Amino acid sequence: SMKYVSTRGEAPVLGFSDALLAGLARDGGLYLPQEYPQFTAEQIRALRGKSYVEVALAVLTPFTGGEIPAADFERMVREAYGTFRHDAVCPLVQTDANEFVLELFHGPTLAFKDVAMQLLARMMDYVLAQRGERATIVGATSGDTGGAAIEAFGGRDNTDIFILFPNGRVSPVQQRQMTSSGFSNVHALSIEGNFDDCQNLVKGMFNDLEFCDALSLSGVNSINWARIMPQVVYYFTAALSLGAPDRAVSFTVPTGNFGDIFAGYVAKRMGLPIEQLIIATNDNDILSRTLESGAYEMRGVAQTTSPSMDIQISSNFERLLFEAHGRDAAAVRGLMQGLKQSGGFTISEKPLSAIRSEFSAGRSTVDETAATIESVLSKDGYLLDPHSAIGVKVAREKASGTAPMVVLATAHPAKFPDAVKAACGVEPQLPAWLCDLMQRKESFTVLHNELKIVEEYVRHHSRA
Numbered sequence: 001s002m003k004y005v006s007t008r009g010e011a012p013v014l015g016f017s018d019a020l021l022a023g024l025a026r027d028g029g030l031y032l033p034q035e036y037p038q039f040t041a042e043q044i045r046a047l048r049g050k051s052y053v054e055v056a057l058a059v060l061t062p063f064t065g066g067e068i069p070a071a072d073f074e075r076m077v078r079e080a081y082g083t084f085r086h087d088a089v090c091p092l093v094q095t096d097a098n099e100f101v102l103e104l105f106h107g108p109t110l111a112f113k114d115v116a117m118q119l120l121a122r123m124m125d126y127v128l129a130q131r132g133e134r135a136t137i138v139g140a141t142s143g144d145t146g147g148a149a150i151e152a153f154g155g156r157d158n159t160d161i162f163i164l165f166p167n168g169r170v171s172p173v174q175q176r177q178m179t180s181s182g183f184s185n186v187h188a189l190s191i192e193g194n195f196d197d198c199q200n201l202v203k204g205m206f207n208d209l210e211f212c213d214a215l216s217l218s219g220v221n222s223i224n225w226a227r228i229m230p231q232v233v234y235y236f237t238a239a240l241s242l243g244a245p246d247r248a249v250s251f252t253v254p255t256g257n258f259g260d261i262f263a264g265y266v267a268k269r270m271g272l273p274i275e276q277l278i279i280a281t282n283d284n285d286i287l288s289r290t291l292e293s294g295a296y297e298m299r300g301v302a303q304t305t306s307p308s309m310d311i312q313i314s315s316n317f318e319r320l321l322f323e324a325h326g327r328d329a330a331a332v333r334g335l336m337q338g339l340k341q342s343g344g345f346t347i348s349e350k351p352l353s354a355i356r357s358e359f360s361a362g363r364s365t366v367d368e369t370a371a372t373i374e375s376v377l378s379k380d381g382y383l384l385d386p387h388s389a390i391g392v393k394v395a396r397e398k399a400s401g402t403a404p405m406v407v408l409a410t411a412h413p414a415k416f417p418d419a420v421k422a423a424c425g426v427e428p429q430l431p432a433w434l435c436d437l438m439q440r441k442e443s444f445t446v447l448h449n450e451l452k453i454v455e456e457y458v459r460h461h462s463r464a
């Protein structure tokens, strides 16, 4: 059935369930399918008319290698996307004659990480149950990821989740989503320290091998194969709305750690006809500079109005590097060794050409992003958040061809009201079902920034 191999070539070859629990490989690499499941044009035509859930079952099942029985998989996919307050799950809104926005923000935290998290948490619950295990999920957030994680893992049977965030330094909306979920297996830890301090405590816990063992610790991050896998689906559903497979479709993705756009690459590898895949970056433009020059070189991180894309390095870019080098693990090891030692590497000509043959990249500054929010509101009556506006700006600059362009809208404007207001004067409004959010009771524990204090809290409260 399906096996999973590391980008660094010397880790155990794993089945789906293990790849899901392993996370990062033994050799320091990232897991990828040994081969991609394939869909012919007729097999894609056969998806026409199907619900989001039905397309998800078709597209994702081959990746699970027969390890999750069909009835169980078509409960957990149904339940995952039942949390999205939109019948289409991820609907298109047309913004110009050949341009559409794919709204990934109808889920429980109004942001695109819900798509993968809501299924990942259920798949993990199932795998753990099947092995008679439990897990203690631990992560640090500046606000947004923690919410998505807590809304996904809240109320799962086999996990307890602990998210550390900086006391007094999270936006009101973001904090309330972490702390008012009402679930008994959720623990929001407000650390008397900054985001970097929260990350250091998490790294501390993961380095404490006895602690990890005793608590069955597992991480929240962008590099597990199951944060990426579910995202393949909406490339299919969007492209089917626009006539797949009989015409190719292009996508622009506001991109930070590359997992989103890598899922689009995966869709293409599976047979979805895709013309352009366009990386859209903020002022932290390592990926844009990489496509221009081949020089993936770390520079200082700028704070922008699209903070979820404020990256120094792109955590899943390594997955594309592996594919671009024809799965030459030694080449990938070399480049990553270079990054670690010297802060950059240069991609050689053949793999760089392979990347450029399928991807392009552009950037949007804070002012350009604001200008895009204001013009799209003015011309269409349509309100973008800043991350999504980056996508629209870059899509319009970089699009080439006759294919329809789908721009991924990765957050609701109400998630970043300051930047939206600054750009266009509108104070965005929360969806009606969330209109009470600011009145929900918060419930969180303030802890000092000390590894032993946090470990004791986790030890006391985890059921693991």
Ligand SMILES: *Cc1c(COP(=O)(O)O)cnc(C)c1O
Binding pocket: 111, 112, 113, 144, 222, 254, 255, 256, 257, 258, 259, 260, 261, 308, 309, 387, 410, 411
């Ligand atoms: C995480 C995030 C991105 C970047 O996603 P990657 O898969 O890491 O490239 C873009 N926009 C928003 C709103 C996000 O939360």
